[PDB]
Enzyme design. Structure first.
Site, PDB file in Angstrom:
ATOM      1  CB  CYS A  23      -1.212   0.387   1.610  1.00  0.00           C
ATOM      2  SG  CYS A  23      -2.729   1.114   1.146  1.00  0.00           S
ATOM      3  CG  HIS A  35      -3.549  -4.015   3.138  1.00  0.00           C
ATOM      4  ND1 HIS A  35      -2.576  -4.087   4.106  1.00  0.00           N
ATOM      5  CD2 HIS A  35      -4.114  -3.048   2.981  1.00  0.00           C
ATOM      6  CE1 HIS A  35      -2.340  -2.631   4.309  1.00  0.00           C
ATOM      7  NE2 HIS A  35      -3.477  -2.123   3.631  1.00  0.00           N
ATOM      8  CD  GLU A  38      -0.544  -6.429   5.588  1.00  0.00           C
ATOM      9  OE1 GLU A  38      -0.478  -7.439   3.907  1.00  0.00           O
ATOM     10  OE2 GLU A  38      -1.044  -5.915   5.944  1.00  0.00           O
TER      11      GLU A  38
END
Ligand SMILES: Nc1ccn([C@@H]2O[C@H](COP(=O)(O)OP(=O)(O)OP(=O)(O)O)[C@@H](O)[C@H]2F)c(=O)n1
Ligand SMILES: Nc1ccn([C@@H]2O[C@H](COP(=O)(O)OP(=O)(O)OP(=O)(O)O)[C@@H](O)[C@H]2F)c(=O)n1
Ligand SMILES: Nc1ccn([C@@H]2O[C@H](COP(=O)(O)OP(=O)(O)OP(=O)(O)O)[C@@H](O)[C@H]2F)c(=O)n1
Lengths: 533, 533, 533
Positions: B379, B505, B507
């Site tokens: 990001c 994202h 993750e």
């Protein structure tokens, strides 16, 4: 000079009369020349009582500034001359609404918003806002200590006491000391357990107000004093009374105001309770008796008409007339007929919303007008008077409010935006105090003895000015108007001993000491009718 | 079949690992073929964590449906395959917001709105909404039992247990059993006092999860069993562990899942924890070691990057590489220079908002690109990669985001509405899962091994397509796009061993069992760089 | 002159070191020239520890006046020079015995005897009796606040604080602030919940003593200060320490004694802790090391020999020797032989009752005597030394105590009433301080450097003077006697580097600051032996 706070809590039961106790103490302190105010913290989630039903909550009280508040603020204004505002009443709902508004906005700068300190901070800020600028602020905490709903209020006022100090804060705790036939004594055990709940949340009471159906003897007050570690003079007996007007005298006789002034280091003269002694004397020495019928749709809870019932009592005081208030269901008039309106010296139709029971109120207004029985209509009471006269004198068939019959031919009551005549042609929620202009040679112009008055509104539906002139030609008189739109505030039926109906709520400006010109006139008319029979 | 609820509470202290305990138990039950879900009740007043600072709260976790949630839902998704939504997390703020909305609207029909039953009803309704349709629902209650902030949650789940019955509800209470050097034993007294608090609010615990820095011996578990009136097999030791992946095995070895299945009358096969045994084996048997620098502006609280730290660990498992995560303050790069980025096998710049520390991240991206150090930008990490390349390769002087320098000549990052070129000419918050189209012959097209992927967004500022072509001509490659506007999702620097930066994202979709193609590739590159030195 | 009271309570867990904390603070106040005492209120029902087993509760401490007390009075006398008596320790059992005695004989004049006020009055009377005539009285309340067992004690001291006032009373509350690896911080939540329990029973703490396995940082202390409404200087960190001798200095460095002297308006000079600084220095800087075997029958609880273990440490301090105390089961000497007594620089046989393990102690005494290993026998340790010498040197086969073998031919140890010779011919519990006459040219006469000493007894069985002269003729020397009956108090074996055994308990008069002549001599002999080997 530093502002002093008296935190008023209740234990054992809800219905201790915390409001009347706070108001009665405020009256003593005001009578010693102190600048005093009272504030009510309600633990319900309603942002305000504007939504709450009269038969569930009791009357919505309206302050001069147009706040919709708990009926306790009616008690406050009837005991002290300090004017109430939005600042004198707030709910858990209001606190959470304001914290959520700030949070969603971003005022907490990405912080985790918590019951402590953010909810408690919001409570303290509103208490300070209502309190600062007065000598003594009485802060009534709604609910019963030990319940989860009031825990944030109690933590907030605990913090305030730490910050401000014991020199300018007091905890006044009402408790029930109930009589047991089996023991033949009043019991302190509930007070013991209630005070333990207070201690557990970090509050030590300074003053115990002992509620019972009889005097709490010195021996029992001595027990309470020891287990609470307070002086005996800080333990007060407040027995059930026939008149709340006696409570200031009862509290003063036990030196409660002396103890408070000593704790706050206030040098002020002894309370002169002459005004309260006079109200008590008037009440105890009536010359005659009347029965006044209150015909409404919320009679299942009398507190729905709290200020109206008190206003009628105040009308009694000023005339030395004992008023027997007979609550009559307007729906019983619809089913059983005008039979149930017999043996009344006067008829009062109070405020309300929705069509249920309204036809019964119209029939009631007709009965009073045709049989020359003194009539007072308040808000909805004025609507049904106008509808009665429109239908049965001005010959406007099925005349009604747009609230009840939206597409009626003669909308004599309607929103300003809905205003239409019988042909469907058109022109090219009011809250709080507004000036009203009284018409020369009207009954109200004489009673109020002034060309202009200030009374409080809680209504949206107005008199339709497009259909008014026709009703005026039929004999109905406009006695009061307001604003640029010249909205009808008061109507009178001339060929009648006493027929008055108003849009505003005069019951909200009535007090036992000052009375009210309209209610004084109404009860006088009721007395004169009773004598004529 | 009836839905079963396990209410998970904590006593003595906050930081018991209630989330990891609930998630670990859910993993066992899922491994027995049960349909299980987890739900988090947060007692903070924030409507959701969307406003809450990373350095105060920890990371904002994003579900597929685009809900901004507590990082506990990251634990949940990393332990069970049941997908989380808005329904798996709510706050006191959300409950009050919804009750106030209903109240102001008029859904309570003029009733007094109360903590009981209206707030508790709203809580129960949201628990049922998230729970119904599953075999077992684990409901984590935030806070410590005895605190006022969780009292409404505890009263709500108490009522649910009465309604549903003990056949389909369990109370699982985490407690601290701390070791005292002076006594040479773990102490049950805090558990005794915590369980007393539970009993006082009408909850009897069924299961005690005993947290300590060591095994809670059978003798101490026997004491707890007696004073709680639960079977000894319902008292579980959960000592501090080096790996949370071991907790499912630790709980299963004490038969916790057996007890739960017996209480809920669930006939299901023994839990096969082979997938967890494999994760533990991988973790315990690394072949090589790397040091990866995480350069961000929230390193003062590591939990700000919770899912990123776990994603790097998962990248280690899949490569048999031990990852040493070095948290580096991007502001230290601004002051001390690129000196502090020495001895790194790879560099990761994670997400963030606001200009503070961003210039340090741009310098970090430049350092990684010029020195051929493996780089992953997430990001804000992608923004600073694009800015670095725009400035130092495409020769776009002082290129920036409109977020940081609104009136910059080269707004290479900007809102779609702000999109302008260097001459000021113009054209004629994204949350949750979105499909991304990967470009042929890109590194990510190979790593993901599919033409399209689904990843989760939390951002508003996009790559400015008006200035993109110039940066593409300077050698930067677009590797991923999304939507009708063809917004840039992934960028790559070709003349580099491993340089990838993404808008989404990744993750949030990484798990220890399944890993993640991007993090697996990143850690592999880190290993290959380390060997080359 | 007005006596000041510090009430010392504990929360969260029992094992906070309330006694050591109270004793350490008392030591600081005594070092300011104040007249201080300490008392222990024990919530157990045992009238006193006279009955309580050594291996369950630990050593029975004996005061000068011959009271059998909690081992905490050992801590008290090792920290202050003020002598303890029966008045410095009492149990719930003692209080109920007191009240039941008064009631049955009719002191309450037919009144209903109640927990309040009669039990609480009995507690207050004993606290005043022990306290009055001192500057500061520290009152340790056994148990954990919130438990039912200490409620009467807590109500009693609450009443005392109201009567005496906040000018001459303080509440010092020990609490556990545990470290959680998960959060990497110490947790105040247990303190929050413990203090709430204190408030619920009407006690507001003045001082918070924060126990943890590390320093409680200023940030956490500040949190505790706010939620307890006490000054930050009234919140003290007391981390786990390697030596209790450091605690007075640690408390002084945080100005605890300054705060107490301010609160009690005590003008006294700064605490001179030079003697404590010396003790800490001595302990930290041993020149050599010795291994001393303590061979007894209660080793399964080291606290059974609390004062003996401390006395050996004090012996170390005065010789600058590190003492490795090896606790050896005397029953293991019986089964495994003298093999397990190898590698000892000295042997100590402490006090005991009953025959179990005694034969092992006799074998141990023989081993020490024959192999010239320094020996100190206390009470039972003297009996076994006499029995050894009688059997193996004076050739009195099967010589024993009448406690163990009542019908034995040579009762060398027996009650005075049982005294007989080998032919059965005849002549014609000792508690607390008694004068003992030391024999000229004896080792103990040299060590004590006085013709008379005062030491404390707790024994029934004496040396049989009818069989003594035959043991004397065989070489044994009587080193000390007492009373009209010339009872043997000390024996010595001449042909030995250091062999002393006494009837009295010298461990009860040993302190870290003053040491003890016997223990100092014993540890010196242990070092001299270690040098020769
Ligand atoms: N925290 C407390 C306080 C008191 N007690 C007990 O309480 C008994 C008297 O309790 P009683 O109901 O007979 O009389 P009372 O209190 O004067 O209350 P009341 O008649 O005015 O309602 C008395 O033995 C005392 F030991 C208690 O156990 N725990
Ligand atoms: N509601 C309660 C429960 C217990 N008690 C008292 O409690 C004492 C043991 O209390 P202890 O701290 O010595 O030992 P424990 O409990 O095993 O706790 P722990 O070492 O595992 O932390 C014991 O006399 C009992 F009378 C109480 O008064 N009120
Ligand atoms: N009577 C009380 C007191 C506090 N609270 C709540 O308590 C939350 C913080 O509670 P935390 O465990 O996270 O942090 P802490 O308190 O500093 O405790 P610690 O880390 O030192 O152990 C916070 O939202 C506050 F609203 C409560 O509900 N009722």
């Amino acid at each position: 000079m530093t502002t002093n706070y008296i935190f008023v809590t209740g234990g054992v039961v809800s219905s201790l009369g915390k409001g009347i106790a706070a108001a009665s103490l405020a009256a003593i302190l005001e009578a010693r020349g102190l600048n005093v105010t009272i504030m009510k913290l309600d633990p319900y989630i309603n942002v305000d009582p504007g939504t709450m039903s009269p038969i569930q909550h009791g009357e919505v009280f309206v302050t001069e500034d147009g706040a919709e508040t708990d009926l306790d603020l009616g008690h406050y204004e009837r005991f002290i001359r300090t004017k109430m505002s939005r600042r004198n009443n707030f709910t858990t709902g209001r606190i959470y609404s304001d914290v959520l508004r700030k949070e969603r906005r971003g005022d907490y700068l990405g912080a985790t918003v918590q019951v402590i300190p953010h909810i408690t901070n919001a409570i303290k800020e509103r208490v300070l806002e209502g309190g600062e600028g007065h000598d003594v602020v009485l802060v009534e905490i709604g609910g019963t200590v030990g319940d989860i709903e009031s825990l944030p209020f109690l933590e907030a006022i605990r913090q305030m006491a730490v910050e401000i100090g014991r020199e300018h804060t007091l905890f006044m705790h009402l408790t029930l000391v109930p009589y047991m036939a089996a023991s033949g004594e009043v019991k302190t055990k509930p007070t013991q357990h209630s005070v333990k709940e207070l201690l557990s949340i970090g509050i030590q009471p300074d003053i115990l107000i002992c509620r019972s159906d009889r005097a709490v003897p010195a021996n029992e007050r001595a027990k309470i004093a020891l287990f609470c570690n307070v002086p005996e003079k800080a333990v007060i007996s407040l027995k059930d009374v026939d008149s709340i007007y006696k409570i200031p005298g009862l509290l003063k006789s036990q030196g409660l105001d002396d103890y408070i002034c000593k704790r706050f280091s206030l040098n002020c003269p002894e309370a002169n309770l002459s005004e309260w002694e006079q109200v008590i004397f008037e009440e105890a020495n009536p010359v005659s008796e009347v029965t006044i019928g209150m015909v409404g749709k919320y009679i299942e809870l009398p507190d729905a008409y709290k200020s109206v019932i008190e206003a009628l009592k105040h009308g009694g005081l000023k005339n030395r007339v004992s008023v027997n208030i007979k609550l009559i269901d307007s729906q019983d008039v619809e089913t059983r007929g005008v039979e149930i309106l017999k043996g009344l010296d006067a008829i009062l139709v109070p405020g309300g919303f929705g069509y249920r029971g309204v036809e019964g109120m119209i029939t009631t207004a007709r009965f009073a007008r045709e049989n020359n029985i003194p009539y007072l209509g308040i808000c909805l009471g004025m609507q049904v008077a106008l509808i009665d006269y429109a239908r049965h004198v001005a010959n406007m068939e099925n005349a009604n409010s747009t609230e009840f019959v939206p597409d009626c031919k003669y909308p004599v009551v309607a929103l300003i935006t809905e205003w239409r005549d019988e042909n469907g042609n058109v022109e090219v929620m009011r809250l709080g105090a507004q000036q009203c202009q009284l018409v020369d040679d009207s009954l109200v112009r004489q009673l109020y003895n002034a060309p202009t008055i200030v009374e409080r509104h809680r209504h949206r539906y107005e008199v339709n000015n497009m259909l008014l002139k026709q009703i005026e030609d039929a004999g109905l008189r406009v006695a009061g108007r307001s604003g640029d739109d010249q909205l009808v505030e008061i109507i009178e039926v001339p060929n009648h001993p006493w027929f008055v109906a108003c849009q505003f709520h005069p019951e909200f400006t009535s007090t036992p000491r000052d009375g009210h010109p309209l209610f004084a006139g109404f009860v006088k008319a009721a007395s004169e009718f009773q004598k004529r029979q």
